[PDB]
UniProtKB/Swiss-Prot annotation, chain A:
This is Large ribosomal subunit protein uL16. PROSITE patterns: RIBOSOMAL_L16_1, RIBOSOMAL_L16_2. Keywords: Hydroxylation, Methylation, Ribonucleoprotein, Ribosomal protein, RNA-binding, rRNA-binding, tRNA-binding. Belongs to the universal ribosomal protein uL16 family. SUPFAM superfamilies: Ribosomal protein L16p/L10e (SSF54686). Is hydroxylated on Arg-81 by RoxA. The modification is nearly suppressed when E.coli is grown in anoxia. It comes from Escherichia coli (strain K12). One of its GO terms (cellular component) is cytosolic large ribosomal subunit.
UniProtKB/Swiss-Prot annotation, chain C:
The gene is rplR. One of its GO terms (cellular component) is cytosol. Keywords: Phosphoprotein, Ribonucleoprotein, Ribosomal protein, RNA-binding, rRNA-binding. It comes from Escherichia coli (strain K12). Part of the 50S ribosomal subunit; part of the 5S rRNA/L5/L18/L25 subcomplex. Contacts the 5S and 23S rRNAs. Gene3D superfamilies: 3.30.420.100. The protein has been shown to contain a phosphoserine, which was required for the protein to bind to 5S rRNA. However, the presence of this phosphoserine is controversial, and it has not been seen by mass spectrometry. PANTHER family: 39S RIBOSOMAL PROTEIN L18, MITOCHONDRIAL (PTHR12899), LARGE RIBOSOMAL SUBUNIT PROTEIN UL18M (PTHR12899:SF3). GO terms for molecular function: 5S rRNA binding; structural constituent of ribosome. It comes from the Bacteria. This is one of the proteins that mediates the attachment of the 5S rRNA subcomplex onto the large ribosomal subunit where it forms part of the central protuberance. Binds stably to 5S rRNA; increases binding abilities of L5 in a cooperative fashion; both proteins together confer 23S rRNA binding. The 5S rRNA and some of its associated proteins might help stabilize positioning of ribosome-bound tRNAs. The keyword Ribosomal protein applies. This is Large ribosomal subunit protein uL18.
Swiss-Prot record, chain D:
It comes from the Bacteria. It holds the Pfam family Ribosomal_L27. One of its GO terms (molecular function) is ribosome binding. It comes from Escherichia coli (strain K12). This is Large ribosomal subunit protein bL27. Coiled coil: none annotated. InterPro entries: Ribosomal_bL27, Ribosomal_bL27_CS. Part of the 50S ribosomal subunit. Cross-links to the 23S rRNA. Cross-links to the A and P site tRNAs. One of its GO terms (biological process) is assembly of large subunit precursor of preribosome. The keyword Signal does not apply. Disulfide bonds: none annotated. The keyword Nucleotidyltransferase does not apply.
UniProtKB/Swiss-Prot annotation, chain E:
GO terms for biological process: cytoplasmic translation; ribosomal large subunit assembly. This is Large ribosomal subunit protein uL30. It comes from Escherichia coli (strain K12). The lineage of its organism: Bacteria, Pseudomonadati, Pseudomonadota, Gammaproteobacteria, Enterobacterales. CDD domains: Ribosomal_L30. PROSITE patterns: RIBOSOMAL_L30. Pfam families: Ribosomal_L30 (PF00327).
Length: 136, 94, 116, 75, 58
RNA sequence: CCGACUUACCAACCCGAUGCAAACUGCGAAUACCGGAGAAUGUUAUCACGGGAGACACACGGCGGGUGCUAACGUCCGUCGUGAAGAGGGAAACAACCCAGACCGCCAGCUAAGGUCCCAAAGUCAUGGUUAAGUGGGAAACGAUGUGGGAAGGCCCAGAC
RNA sequence: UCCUCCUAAAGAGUAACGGAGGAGCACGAAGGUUGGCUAAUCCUGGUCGGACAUCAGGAGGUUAGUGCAAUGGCAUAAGCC
RNA sequence: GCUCAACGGAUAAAAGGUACUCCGGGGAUAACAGGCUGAUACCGCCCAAGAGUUCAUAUCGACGGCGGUGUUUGGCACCU
RNA sequence: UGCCUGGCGGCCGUAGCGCGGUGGUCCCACCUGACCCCAUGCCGAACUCAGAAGUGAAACGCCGUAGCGCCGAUGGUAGUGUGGGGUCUCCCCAUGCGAGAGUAGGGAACUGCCAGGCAA
């Protein structure tokens, strides 16, 4: 699981997820899995969508992960009344906005990459799409 | 044969720009050289097909706006963040 | 640098002097030719300026790089400034240690009538 | 563990540009030296810029470091 | 100088404090209350502020 | 001991490329607020002093947020509206939602929201399309030669599917 | 109880058993003024000397320091003698 | 001269039990039940590595994803 | 009147660094020496004084070069005041405002008072 090594503060606000993303272009690889739907990806989902992505295009090829969680999400224990403070950080999510390239792949056939990103899209909550690296 | 048909805008800004982008017509502009930057309005469907070919961003184009031909080079383009379409193109008058 | 180090030493007394709105006597020293001039409170123009570089002063000196030459400057500035009517001025060392020629310039100006 | 905070000191710029003040009137109640003492404006031990003369406030941006200054044109 | 006419077309109940204050500044009391004011950019700015509830006629 | 070369590896700092931040800022709105001038408008709506108070359980909706599970007709604030202390028409019924502020009377008319086949006042109105599901009239990832519109392209009676 | 930042929605203020940390002093000098000076960290060289004592130069540039937590500020130095 | 630190400081000086209890109130505030919600609970679906001699989908189903119900444990205190 | 140089500013990166060329009649800096004024918590480095053979290396000034720093539109986008709408954890529509980044390009400053040198 992708987790930040010693951030400045342990717990942080909820925060709204309004707007549109910036990392929209396919930069390192040539094919991408652009996120269409707004949401939040835990470190479990990103890690799970990679194993079943780095299996379809074998030991060959290189996969880029354009996302990193860096946002702690609290979870109160069961049977605990409200109040008494902020809960305990359990997992780390990554606020995904529409147009955020989630993954990039290079070193494989386009039709193979078309099918690899079909296996990873079924492991993520947000609706995705298949985009191609454009000439400028 | 990269010859795009264009027009001259009369309205601009957030409200007037999205108003015609909802009609298969995305704006653009031709700047550079010594002339004043021309508010070029052009169709989307034709241009969306031309940019498929990689020669579009290398070969010197030709924009016939109101009869006047202008030979340019597509400088900067703004694609829709998640949809396969365009929003605006910067044409350097070369 | 030797020159820039002198400018920061002057800044303390320059900035304090314009808020007060005083007519400062800016004295510039050099291994030869000790300079001097009176500048208006606006910080832009000078009103009275006299130094050894003028032929009117250098031709009555042995060498334009010492005390008796510096004493010749202070008298000249304080006598032509008392012509324009500038009486009460301030003395700006311009970062120079008030001890030799910068001291001699004031001593010649204090006795003339230049109030400071 | 938390649950502690201070009493708001009511800082900020009291009199703004173009506002006629009196002698001694506080122009800016600040912490450090965001704004500096320009012309006809003093500076207290609290770094509080007060007006040393009647007139109007005039914020400026002088200096080789673009630091803010506050002057007063006698009006 | 020439004048202009302003007529209130909607109520002023569920409106912000600066919307009820504008109708006070124009003279409009109830809906349909016709009023006549001078045509100046001072008034033109007031009509442009509550344009959703006023129907001006030049 | 000095100390050279090499490595199925990990990698400091710089450099190019890429994202994130309530407790980051080489930038930076819209509003809001303070001051000046000007016209119109408002039964002075303004401030000060004095007599009398009540009130210091608030609620819901919008927007901006903390907390919670971006759960709660949840909890706590900013700001506005409404209720509280406001009836009336609509939302089937429904303080807090939309419209609108009841001095009284009238078997008068025009309109707001919302509606116009019958219950139940008003279009079984007009032109052009869509839908086969009673959809409209509860809901997701995902699945499918359902079906309509638009642009582009491959192959094609030198015979394609 | 008091102080600093966030929450706090670009004036001020603004809540919760919301998120982060401190104080209940110290100093006759660490105060006043006058004069002067300006760092941290690396790189190179050098007796004991070593990752790190003192010394010389360069690079760098205020990433230093500021009696003490944090924020604002500071070379015109409020930092150092 | 006061950790009058419960720090606008009730006295200079003060801890507990009550199932023997009692009075005045509160659904301003809990236990049981209802309501709102659905984290947890139960049920179903999606992708699918892999298991099943061979073979993903006879039968199961990793790593993750999306809903339903309103039986569990709870949250909220709207009703008494 | 112009090129030069020094002083005090205005404005303060279009104004600052990098690289190269270049100036010494004046001026400036370096420089020579130190009984004395004064001086270093050691030392004429600095500060100071008395002078001035030599130099333009260093320092500073000036001219070119854009290798960087920096400045920077038009257009679009993000956001947003007010009024409406929706598949209302987020958007859209009408009207007004309109960034930041990036791009064309600009760019190695501009200018005033005084005092000298100089060709006149
Ligand atoms: Mg708009
Ligand atoms: Mg608190
Ligand atoms: Mg505070
Ligand atoms: Mg309303
Ligand atoms: Mg920049
Ligand atoms: Mg505010
Ligand atoms: Mg005002
Ligand atoms: Mg007025
Ligand atoms: Mg009370
Ligand atoms: Mg209360
Ligand atoms: Mg909310
Ligand atoms: Mg509530
Ligand atoms: Mg409240
Ligand atoms: Mg009512
Ligand atoms: Mg009703
Ligand atoms: Mg209903
Ligand atoms: Mg009814
Ligand atoms: Mg009434
Ligand atoms: Mg009618
Ligand atoms: Mg209607
Ligand atoms: Mg009927
Ligand atoms: Mg009909
Ligand atoms: Mg149905
Ligand atoms: Mg208190
Ligand atoms: Mg504030
Ligand atoms: Mg101190
Ligand atoms: Mg000093
Ligand atoms: Mg060694
Ligand atoms: Mg060493
Ligand atoms: Mg001190
Ligand atoms: Mg007590
Ligand atoms: Mg108390
Ligand atoms: Mg009893
Ligand atoms: Mg009882
Ligand atoms: Mg219960
Ligand atoms: Mg097998
Ligand atoms: Mg039940
Ligand atoms: Mg229950
Ligand atoms: Mg209750
Ligand atoms: Mg409550
Ligand atoms: Mg009940
Ligand atoms: Mg040289
Ligand atoms: Mg623009
Ligand atoms: Mg929401
Ligand atoms: Mg810009």
């Amino acid at each position: 699981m992708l987790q930040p090594k010693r951030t400045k503060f342990r717990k942080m606000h909820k925060g709204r997820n309004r707007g549109l993303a910036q990392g929209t272009d396919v930069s390192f690889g040539s094919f991408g899995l652009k996120a269409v739907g707004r949401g939040r990806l835990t470190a479990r989902q990103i890690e799970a969508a990679r194993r079943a992505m780095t299996r379809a295009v074998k030991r060959q090829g290189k996969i880029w992960i354009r996302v990193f969680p860096d946002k702690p999400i609290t979870e109160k224990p069961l049977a605990v009344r409200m109040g008494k403070g902020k809960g305990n950080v359990e997992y780390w999510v990554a606020l995904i906005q529409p147009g955020k390239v989630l993954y990039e792949m290079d070193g494989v056939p386009e039709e193979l990459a078309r099918e690899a990103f079909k296996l990873a899209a079924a492991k993520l909550p947000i609706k995705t799409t298949f985009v191609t690296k454009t000439v400028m | 044969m990269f010859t795009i048909n264009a027009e001259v805008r009369k309205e601009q800004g957030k409200g007037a720009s999205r108003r015609l982008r909802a009609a298969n017509k995305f704006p653009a502009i031709i700047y550079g050289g010594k002339e004043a930057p021309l508010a070029i309005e052009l169709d989307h469907d034709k241009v969306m097909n031309m940019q498929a070919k990689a020669e579009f961003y290398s070969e010197v184009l030709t924009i016939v706006v109101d009869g006047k031909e202008i030979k340019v080079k597509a400088q900067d383009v703004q694609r829709h963040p998640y949809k396969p379409k365009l929003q605006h193109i910067d044409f350097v008058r070369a | 640098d030797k020159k820039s180090a002198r400018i920061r030493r002057a800044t303390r007394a320059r900035r304090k002097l314009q808020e007060l709105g005083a007519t400062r006597l800016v004295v510039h020293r050099t291994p030869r030719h000790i300079y001097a001039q009176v500048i208006a409170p606006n910080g832009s123009e000078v009103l009275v300026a006299a130094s050894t570089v003028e032929k009117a002063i250098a031709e009555q000196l042995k060498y334009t790089g010492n005390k008796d030459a510096a004493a010749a400057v202070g008298k000249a500035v304080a006598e032509r400034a008392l012509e324009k009517g500038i009486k009460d001025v301030s003395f700006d060392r311009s970062g120079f240690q008030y001890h030799g020629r910068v001291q001699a310039l004031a001593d010649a100006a204090r006795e003339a009538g230049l109030q400071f | 563990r938390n649950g502690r905070d201070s009493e708001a000191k009511r800082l900020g710029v009291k009199r703004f540009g173009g506002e006629s003040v009196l002698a001694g009137s506080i122009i800016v109640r600040q912490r450090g030296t965001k704004f500096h003492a320009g012309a006809n404006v003093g500076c207290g031990r609290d770094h509080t810029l007060f007006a040393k003369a009647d007139g109007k406030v005039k914020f400026e941006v002088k200096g080789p470091k673009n630091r803010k200054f506050i002057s007063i044109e006698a009006e | 100088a020439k004048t202009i006419k302003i007529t209130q077309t909607r109520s002023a109940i569920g409106r912000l404090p600066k919307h009820k204050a504008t109708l006070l500044g124009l003279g409009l009391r109830r809906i349909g209350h016709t009023v006549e004011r001078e045509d100046t950019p001072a008034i033109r700015g007031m009509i442009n502020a509550v344009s959703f509830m006023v129907k001006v006629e030049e």
